[PDB]
């Protein structure tokens, strides 16, 4: 009935700090397809994050990869917010610039 | 070579009088093409790759009313399932479609495809003689009785040995020299703080297309298959792929660790080492 | 060229 998302939460770019860059957060093997994703920036939503279109894969999983620009520093912190129907709570996956 | 087609369709219901979404996606090498999507403005079928450009508007018009049909289509059989299971109205449900072709390495037709998935779970499929279906559950018996009484099967089969081709074989025409790219990855090593004198060596294999790749360590060049992390390959949102594999190695000797890349794209398999 | 429905589920 029900399907847990996958979260991978990186970079476009080998990141720099000062340098303009794109946040990715790759959410897959969801069902069904209708979930909330937000980007955040020390705690704050993001209001400009594009999502590529309703996708789904040979297991009969979505797939959706959720973007935003963004400027990597020392001091701020990002993160994504998924919430699905497949969990009681939404789960959210810092950005580690090693990973 | 080896070469596919199919279209991945899918109808959600939602709460309320609105009516069911129905979104159609085509493949051709697993790379979308085309997109039907009954949300937006004025619902067509779209190019989704250069190559279709090349496509006619009695051809976006066919395929546009075909997509029209499609919605209703799945707006019944929606209403219909919601009876074999016994379910009220109110809720939200899901069905998909997978269909299409793959083409052996004759370039003939290999296998035919045509599955349903119901709340994301195997619904219907037509086995590979194209004539007998195997139904998953007890509701889905109902629709193969009614679909060997209707000879549904037939009408697939002359669309997968028939059309499907076809087409297949003219879209790989118009696209010869997109599908058949290659970027090679671009990579490098990183080094990561050691949990008392044990550091984390990370490779990074970045910008490559297609998506099919192997990272693999190495100690001295011999070969590493145990302890290494590995990251599921992931869009870099242009177009291109990402994915890092790494293995805990004792501070001082890192030099010995190696990081063996292979990926179409490369001339020879790609060998780097920490710094 | 897509395939379509004609016998519903």
Redesign the interface.
């Known amino acids: 009935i029900q399907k847990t998302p996958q979260i991978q939460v990186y970079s476009r770019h080998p990141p720099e700090n000062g340098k303009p860059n794109i946040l990715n957060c790759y959410v897959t093997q969801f069902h069904p397809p209708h979930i909330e994703i937000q980007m955040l920036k020390n705690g704050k939503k993001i209001p400009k994050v594009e999502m590529s279109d309703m996708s789904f894969s040979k297991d009969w999983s979505f797939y959706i990869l959720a973007h935003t620009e963004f400027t990597p520093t020392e001091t701020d912190t990002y993160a994504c917010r998924v919430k699905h129907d497949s969990m009681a709570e939404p789960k959210t996956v810092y950005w580690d610039r090693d990973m | 070579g080896p070469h596919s087609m199919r279209y991945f369709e899918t109808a959600v219901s939602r709460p309320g009088l609105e009516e069911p979404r129905y979104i159609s996606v085509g493949y051709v090498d697993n790379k979308e093409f085309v997109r039907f999507d009954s949300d937006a403005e004025n619902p067509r079928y779209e190019p989704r790759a250069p190559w279709m450009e090349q496509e006619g508007p009695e051809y976006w018009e066919r395929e546009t009313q075909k997509a029209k049909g499609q919605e209703q289509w799945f707006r019944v059989s929606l209403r219909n399932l919601l009876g074999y299971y016994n379910q009220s109205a109110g809720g939200s449900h899901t069905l998909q479609q997978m269909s299409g072709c793959d083409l052996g390495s004759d370039w003939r037709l290999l296998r035919g495809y045509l599955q349903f998935a119901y709340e994301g779970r195997d619904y219907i499929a037509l086995n590979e003689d194209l004539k007998t279906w195997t139904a998953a559950d007890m509701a889905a018996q109902i629709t193969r009785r009614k679909w060997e009484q209707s000879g549904a099967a037939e009408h697939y089969k002359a669309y997968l040995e028939g059309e499907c081709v076809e087409w297949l074989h003219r879209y790989l025409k118009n696209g010869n020299a997109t599908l058949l790219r290659t970027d090679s990855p671009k990579a490098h090593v990183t080094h990561h703080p050691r949990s008392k004198g044990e550091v984390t060596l990370r490779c990074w294999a970045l910008g490559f297309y297609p998506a099919d790749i192997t990272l693999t360590w190495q100690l001295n060049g011999e070969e590493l298959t145990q302890d290494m992390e590995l990251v599921e390959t992931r869009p870099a949102g242009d177009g291109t792929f990402q994915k890092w594999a790494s293995v805990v190695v004792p501070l001082g000797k890192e030099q010995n660790y190696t990081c063996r890349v292979y990926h179409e794209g490369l001339p020879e398999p790609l060998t780097l080492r920490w710094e | 060229?897509?395939?379509?429905?004609?016998?519903?589920?």
Request: zero cysteines; proline letters at 0%.
């Open positions: 060229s897509s395939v379509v429905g004609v016998w519903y589920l």
